[PDB]
Amino acid sequence: GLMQFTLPVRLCKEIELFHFDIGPFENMWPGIFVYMVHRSCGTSCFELEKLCRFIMSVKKNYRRVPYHNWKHAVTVAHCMYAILQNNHTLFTDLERKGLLIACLCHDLDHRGFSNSYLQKFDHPLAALYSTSTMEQHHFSQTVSILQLEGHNIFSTLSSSEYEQVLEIIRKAIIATDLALYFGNRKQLEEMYQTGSLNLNNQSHRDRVIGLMMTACDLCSVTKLWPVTKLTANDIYAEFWAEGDEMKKLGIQPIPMMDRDKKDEVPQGQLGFYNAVAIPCYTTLTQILPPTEPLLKACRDNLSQWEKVIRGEE
Numbered sequence: 001g002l003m004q005f006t007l008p009v010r011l012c013k014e015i016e017l018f019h020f021d022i023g024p025f026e027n028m029w030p031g032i033f034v035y036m037v038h039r040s041c042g043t044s045c046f047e048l049e050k051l052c053r054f055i056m057s058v059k060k061n062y063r064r065v066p067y068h069n070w071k072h073a074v075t076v077a078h079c080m081y082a083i084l085q086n087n088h089t090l091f092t093d094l095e096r097k098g099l100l101i102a103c104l105c106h107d108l109d110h111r112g113f114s115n116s117y118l119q120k121f122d123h124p125l126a127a128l129y130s131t132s133t134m135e136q137h138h139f140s141q142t143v144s145i146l147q148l149e150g151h152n153i154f155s156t157l158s159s160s161e162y163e164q165v166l167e168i169i170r171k172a173i174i175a176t177d178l179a180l181y182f183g184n185r186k187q188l189e190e191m192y193q194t195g196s197l198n199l200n201n202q203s204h205r206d207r208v209i210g211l212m213m214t215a216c217d218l219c220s221v222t223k224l225w226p227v228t229k230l231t232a233n234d235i236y237a238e239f240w241a242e243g244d245e246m247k248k249l250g251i252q253p254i255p256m257m258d259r260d261k262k263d264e265v266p267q268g269q270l271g272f273y274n275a276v277a278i279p280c281y282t283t284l285t286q287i288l289p290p291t292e293p294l295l296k297a298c299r300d301n302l303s304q305w306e307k308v309i310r311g312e313e
């Protein structure tokens, strides 16, 4: 009960900032996650024994892939932590509990391949889940781990609070399917501009939580340039492997995944910042003004890619 997690001074201060990098020491990430749960939720939200067992089972079910790995899970949870801490009063106790767990669990058992590749491969998961294939798998894995003996971190919730939190986590994880982001943000854009956005409307909160999940999921584009640039290598290592696997199915991959077109990466990043990231953090900043630092950091990284193209690096 009286057992706080404490971090070294530098981490204690920087963990509160959106651009925090969780570092190369894997063994500190569980403690960093528990620290965030304690400050974001309370020291009572979860039985520490059960939370610790949950965290270590989640870690075990992330794979050793260059990007969609345990570090990504904790990184995406930290962004959600920073959003929740900068928007104290806007979110329920249930939402703060569910969303940190949703972020930790959102890419469970990722293999480093897109929904498109699963469908073209004719992977069994693509027969079981026609849309948001990996994301329905991720929620399935989350429920599976929650049901391991000693792993139900929600057992102290009432029956209806339990159903509500699993529904928050399900929508949160499904929302990380980028195919759904485009229409979700368009709808949120319309609602904010015509002034119909209403956070007491459950269907509207769902949409806002969805955008928060896209924003946390993409948060590697909101780090200091050296972090963003090195993470970009990790995600391209997965894209190129998928492109290799497309060529093995006798399909020319999209240029994003073709390692023969590495020269086109800088312009491909511009498209991605302009088509996805900048729009995502702009709408998020309009709805949740204290998330502006994510938009500023994202614009800084776009500018750095423009500099790469102009040969200045």
Ligand SMILES: CNC(=O)c1c(NC(=O)c2nc(C3CC3)cnc2Nc2cncnc2)cnn1C
Residues within 6 Å of the ligand: 178, 218, 220, 221, 228, 229, 231, 232, 235, 256, 268, 269, 271, 272, 276
């Ligand atoms: C829809 N367009 C695209 O997905 C797209 C690209 N996607 C990315 O670069 C990228 N995608 C994602 C999730 C959607 C999988 C996450 N992070 C990404 N980039 C990144 C950069 N630096 C650090 N961390 C991450 C590139 N070119 N294209 C046409």
Ligand SMILES: [Mg+2]
Residues within 6 Å of the ligand: 106, 107, 134, 176, 177
């Ligand atoms: Mg995912």
Ligand SMILES: [Zn+2]
Residues within 6 Å of the ligand: 072, 076, 106, 107, 176, 217
């Ligand atoms: Zn992710």
